[PDB]
RNA sequence: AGGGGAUCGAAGAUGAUCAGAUACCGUCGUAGUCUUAACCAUAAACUAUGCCGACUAGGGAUCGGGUGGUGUUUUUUUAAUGACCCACUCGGCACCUUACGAGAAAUCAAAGUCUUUGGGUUCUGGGGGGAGUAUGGUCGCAAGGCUGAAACUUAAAGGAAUUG
């Protein structure tokens, strides 16, 4: 049948979009597809905040952050747990948890 | 069988039929 | 020795309500069946179809029986009942119960000039229940009922005499064909007519009139 | 057709205005456009307290002159309405379904909560929409204290008050009890007020 | 573990519903009452009935239950409902601008203030 | 709507469309093309006299298991060698 | 078992067990 | 573009009667629309209509009164003789005692009963019941 | 409808919705009949004499039943200013 | 054909893996991927929903334009302007609730106004295969495209949804 009213993910008035490449397998997947997450992490993660604070010069200067825009294909996101299979009524909800 | 490779198999058969027609006039 | 549960049952046991006519006029919810057991004597049945149905379980194959039945007296009242039960005698019995719960009337009419106790339907009507349209056309006197045997028996139990029935869709499904004919009978009463264009002083709610005998004991 | 004493009675108008019934919601809805008077700035719509008053009087005409007064039913699940519907039950006939409705209460003749009313009042249609649906199954008229942004489906004569105000809900239930009593005939001398008083109908926290 | 079943809960709720005045707050007395006012056929079951009856009676004397209701409970719940407070004047009515426009459009005395 | 033309002078288009769709139909195409005369083993006839060339025993199709024991005959008026099933029991022994 | 004529099968068994309780009644009347 | 203004008018009337409205607004207008609605009004199927006359084609508001089950147009206007009127009324009237087939006749726009009485036939236009 | 002698047939005339003038079906279990009280001097609604309205299931389903009863109450004088003809 | 040739990379070279692996995995690598002038005319070219027109149900966002506001913030003393807010309107891509209706159902504000069958018009389909095959024509450097059967064979193939 037709599983989704958006045919998988939203295009709605283009016809064609430029594709990106998945970050785990480098599959060419369109930009309206290809689940996009923002990795906001620290270089000085919490197992070493006190270590670098006690071993750093320039006392209390800052702590830098790493920012990544990760495009996952459908197979890689399902395998790596970014996305989950849903029930029929729960597929209609599009609110972040 | 997959229809794509069925199309390819009939394509080879068409080429060989044309070749044997040209061979035997 | 039946006992009423509802206000309508209390009124009909008191015998103050004397007809399904004020029942259908005030569109009262039929919740029990003894009301028209007492009110519609000689309401004969006909079982139309007994059909097995199978649900696939873990290891077995659970087979229930589906009974579709009709009821009618001789003139202008039909009920259609569907029941699914493990025993087919119980299916027939409870289908009779459901058909009595679902008795509805018909608009009989004339094909031409009005002479002697209407024979056919009023208007050309239709009913659709799941890709089966059953269309009922009035017919001249003495032409009989032309239909498949099941629809013919339903209309014979209705008491019409002269119908042309057309039918489209998969008519081999007896349940949908009977349901389509049932909806066609309903729409036959539901149509509006220049005879019905006049205005009536609007009825007076016998439950409201007789609420003191309709109260709790 | 109504006599002159069925008007606003300004002495009851300050009850309405002080209970803050005149305010509505931020959404209008097409079946409640006639009830809306004006749009106050900062996104509030005001409800015509006059129009609420004659709709209340008409609903009193519906609720009164039911020949057996007990068959009227009062449905409540909002936490701001149980005490009000219990007091209305005490004063009038008014069998109460304060609390859970038990879906299958008007149909399903083998339930213990099997009531077959002749008139429903609902404290709030959106939060009690099961009872309105069941009345639609089994041929019962419905009175509702609707809002501007209320579901108008399957509902008869409605009185738009607030459904967001504790005081609004309680005082409208109180007023309806007042007028059904004064039309059925416990209270005479219509110019005189009522001994029972609205903060009795207002609920407590517990 | 020690979860009581539908048999003991159903019987205990019916007995407590229709026999509230004669029941007591002690297990020994209550189980003799169950012996007399119930034709129960099992001794251990009888003890279980009486134990859940006693626990539910403790909760009844502490407060109301959402499972069942009584005639004495009905009298006390009415009286606690018609507890009546004093009236909710501060001179004139409160601040009003366009609902004051509403009241002057309809026409009434209504001494009110502005916003 | 409905795709078909509805105007009062559209009967030419209606006739042309009907002729093409009739060519799509099965029985009409067989009749007009005359496969009864061009390609049928009979000459469009109900019956035909032939003479037996051989007696062939052919196995049934699944799930049935039997030998049907037909004959191979040659038609006199055409020459087309066809295969004819012999009817009820022992008539194979009757036919030589 | 025959799924498609169970209606007649059960009605025939209905007549049969009604008959069997009838001879039970007849035997009771003969003994008494 | 608009090919049959009567078809648009009758579609609007039919849709709003199914919706249960008491009145319709019809744009644009015609002599044939006015005369068809006049036959409707004379047989009582509709109530009263007002013709709003701007200097364009104009509009109509029709106050209905119920009792109009379905009104339909037959496109194209078919050349019906005096012997095919019975075929047409049997094809698309619900019963032989009510309903009218409206003909565009050289004597005027009228129903098939007045056509039978005046003994004159024409182009079939529509039908009401 | 009648016969040749004017003897009544049609065992029951149907009720008509007072909003859309449509036939109220026997199976229409949403269609409600409302009996409004007849008020004489200071209430005292005389028992047995009610102003009656009938609403059909279609009107209730589309949800314009409130608007229809505002209109009908104003037509029969039950209310004075609740429904404006020009929105 | 000419130029350009970094990356990736059909064919291929190898190293794995495997019972086999001229498959998936790893290293390189031809044509190609880029471009100028000519071709080809096919895609799950999909919204699997012809185009034009009218009507039928509510809502909230958004893009572009326009109207109204003794509205907000900005210059240097608060006007213009720009941006933002509110109300409305036209035209878009859509979205949410319901089912008035429609559907075999999934679902649909169109897939509605369809047995109460007719707004205008074009194309396509007639059980599954054989088969987009054979042949004939036409276009093409070819690759192939458009047009396009029959003999023969078969009682199913298939759509939606339910239970295991
Ligand atoms: Zn991937």
Numbering used by the authors:
A (entry chain Sa): 2 to 98
B (entry chain Ln): 1 to 25
C (entry chain SC): 34 to 250
D (entry chain SA): 2 to 207
E (entry chain SR): 2 to 89, 96 to 122
F (entry chain SX): 2 to 97
G (entry chain CS): 111 to 142
H (entry chain SW): 2 to 130
Share the article's original sentences.
Tigecycline is widely used for treating complicated bacterial infections for which there are no effective drugs. It inhibits bacterial protein translation by blocking the ribosomal A-site. However, even though it is also cytotoxic for human cells, the molecular mechanism of its inhibition remains unclear.
Unlike the reported structures, we selected the dataset derived from the tigecycline-stalled monosome sample. Contrary, we do not observe E-site tRNA in our yeast 80S ribosome. Therefore, we cannot confirm the conservation of these two sites.
